[PDB]
Design a protein around this ligand. Sequence first.
Ligand SMILES: Cn1c(=O)c2[nH]cnc2n(C)c1=O
Ligand SMILES: Cn1c(=O)c2[nH]cnc2n(C)c1=O
Ligand SMILES: Cn1c(=O)c2[nH]cnc2n(C)c1=O
Ligand SMILES: Cn1c(=O)c2[nH]cnc2n(C)c1=O
Lengths: 114, 114
Amino acid sequence: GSHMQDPEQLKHCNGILKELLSKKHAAYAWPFYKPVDASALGLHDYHDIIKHPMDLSTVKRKMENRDYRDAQEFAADVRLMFSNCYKYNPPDHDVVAMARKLQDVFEFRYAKMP
Amino acid sequence: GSHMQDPEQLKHCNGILKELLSKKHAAYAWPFYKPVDASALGLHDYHDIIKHPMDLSTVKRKMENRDYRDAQEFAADVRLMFSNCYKYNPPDHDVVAMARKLQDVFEFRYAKMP
Ligand SMILES: Cn1c(=O)c2[nH]cnc2n(C)c1=O
Ligand SMILES: Cn1c(=O)c2[nH]cnc2n(C)c1=O
Ligand SMILES: Cn1c(=O)c2[nH]cnc2n(C)c1=O
Ligand SMILES: Cn1c(=O)c2[nH]cnc2n(C)c1=O
């Protein structure tokens, strides 16, 4: 059920999303900008292992289209994106190191929800 | 709607929970074992800042009582527990360092969901 706080909480989510896409974090956010192109990257098992792909451009489209009804729905998609990275790649992969840094940005600001 | 995979996914969640409570992680998991006793700790603003407290003993009770209907519901509570820590405490607090380590244990194993 919609709560009167949902629009303002979704604005905070949109602010987080803008930050995740901003130049400040680009050195470690770039793998998450667009859907994994598994074939182009030679990751021919990606879609067998990752049944629910997610990336920031998809989160952005869903925000713009008002798909997310509350902050929790938005956060679940962002976390799914990171979990897919942790599931698919070995834990010492540089993309995992980047995911952990970007997820720290996300989690600490999401925790500051007004 | 319940899916036939939900019992086995909740068993994986229960395994994660058991690991989070195990001696292997006790050096950094202990702050999360029981509800924050705000008055006893002198944290007299805790319940003004944290509107939804969560801790591992509460997650355990909810698992034992079949409160969680799927893995996503379980994960949201575990993540709420960590987010409360990130919200309430300064980011250099030792309890935050412990939360980040325990959350890494959680996220990497949750990502290995069968
Ligand atoms: C360093 N780096 C890369 O190595 C890379 N590869 C693809 N986009 C990239 N971007 C945006 C980037 O900043
Ligand atoms: C998200 N992601 C991955 O998980 C990954 N694994 C290997 N290359 C990868 N690339 C380029 C990527 O963007
Ligand atoms: C080190 N340490 C502590 O400092 C502590 N304080 C309360 N429980 C505690 N436990 C279980 C612990 O291991
Ligand atoms: C979870 N948590 C906290 O967030 C915290 N902040 C200060 N002491 C704290 N303690 C003992 C604690 O258990």
